[PDB]
Amino acid sequence: DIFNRDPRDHYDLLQRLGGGTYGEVFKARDKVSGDLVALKMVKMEPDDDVSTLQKEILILKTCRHANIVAYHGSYLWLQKLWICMEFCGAGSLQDIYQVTGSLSELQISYVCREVLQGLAYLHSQKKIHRDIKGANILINDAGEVRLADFGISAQIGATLARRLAPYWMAPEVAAVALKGCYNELCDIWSLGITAIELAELQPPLFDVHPLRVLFLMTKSGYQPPRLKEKGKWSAAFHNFIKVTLTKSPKKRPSATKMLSHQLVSQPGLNRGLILDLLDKLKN
Numbered sequence: 001d002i003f004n005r006d007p008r009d010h011y012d013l014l015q016r017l018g019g020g021t022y023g024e025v026f027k028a029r030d031k032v033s034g035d036l037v038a039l040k041m042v043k044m045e046p047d048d049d050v051s052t053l054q055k056e057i058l059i060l061k062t063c064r065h066a067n068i069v070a071y072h073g074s075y076l077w078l079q080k081l082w083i084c085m086e087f088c089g090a091g092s093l094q095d096i097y098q099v100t101g102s103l104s105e106l107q108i109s110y111v112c113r114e115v116l117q118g119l120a121y122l123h124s125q126k127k128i129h130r131d132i133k134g135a136n137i138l139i140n141d142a143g144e145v146r147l148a149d150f151g152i153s154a155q156i157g158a159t160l161a162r163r164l165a166p167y168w169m170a171p172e173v174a175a176v177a178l179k180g181c182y183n184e185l186c187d188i189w190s191l192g193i194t195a196i197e198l199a200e201l202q203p204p205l206f207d208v209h210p211l212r213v214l215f216l217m218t219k220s221g222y223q224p225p226r227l228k229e230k231g232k233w234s235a236a237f238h239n240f241i242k243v244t245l246t247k248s249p250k251k252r253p254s255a256t257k258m259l260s261h262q263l264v265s266q267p268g269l270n271r272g273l274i275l276d277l278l279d280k281l282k283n
């Protein structure tokens with residue numbers, strides 16, 4: 001459900017937070033309530049198809065969970081669509097680690113736990129993020145963790161619907177038609193890679209060409225990556241990675257199963273750990 005009016009009525013546009021071909025992100029304040037919001041602006045011309053964006057909204061609107069970016073509403077005005085969300089002041093983990101350098105095992109553990117909670121919720125709702133990385137895990141000024149940037153999740157969903165227009169079809173073809181050849185457990189892998197990102201400032205093979213990496217991943221003898229420095233981390237951390245980075249999705253554990261893992265179920269994991277990191281931000 002979409003408000004057909006100028007959002008500059010309801011909000012004040014403070015600051016641009018960056019742009020892409022895909023969208024523009026604005027910091028803004030609610031003129032009445034006074035609370036800060038994130039406003040995602042998308043330039044939608046009459047001719048182009050709106051389904052991709054409609055799917056993103058529907059995902060956001062239909063997700064009420066702590067670890068997923070809250071949605072307030074959306075505004076269609078002057079052929080510009082504004083999606084309104086809760087503000088996450090510290091930004092993404094990538095925005096942050098660029099300044100602070102590498103996170104600590106416990107900070108990583110807390111982040112992983114929080115993402116897993118979000119994923120478990122998403123998967124229960126039969127939704128897949130499919131773009132879990134540092135740059136999509138947002139932090140608020142309170143050190144709470146929020147999953148964001150469902151534009152890809154929306155893009156594959158909008159295609160899956162577009163793909164309606166079956167019996168002589170082969171099972172693998174059916175799987176691509178319905179699910180795209182993969183399942184929810186892809187997110188678990190991405191988390192594993194993200195855990196490495198946070199530890200090392202780069203995912204594995206970041207210096208290698210992308211097309212080449214795709215090739216390497218499809219070879220028979222592809223070994224899952226590990227953490228570079230054995231000694232710097234605990235057995236539980238190494239294992240968390242070993243397990244999340246299970247090559248076979250038949251044998252890779254679910255978000256729920258992962259939440260009971262030693263690393264992410266240990267006590268003392270809370271936002272304080274992240275607050276410590278955000279203090280390193282003003283340093």
Ligand SMILES: COc1cccc(F)c1-c1cc2c(cn1)cnn2-c1ccc(N2CCN(C)CC2)cc1
Pocket residue numbers: 017023025038039040069085086087088089090091092095135136137138148149
């Ligand atoms: C990965 O997030 C996206 C990716 C694509 C399109 C989006 F709309 C988003 C997106 C960003 C969002 C929210 C929802 N979605 C909510 N809060 N924020 C957000 C993100 C960063 C900052 N800065 C970063 C820079 N730092 C110095 C100040 C804080 C401030 C607020």
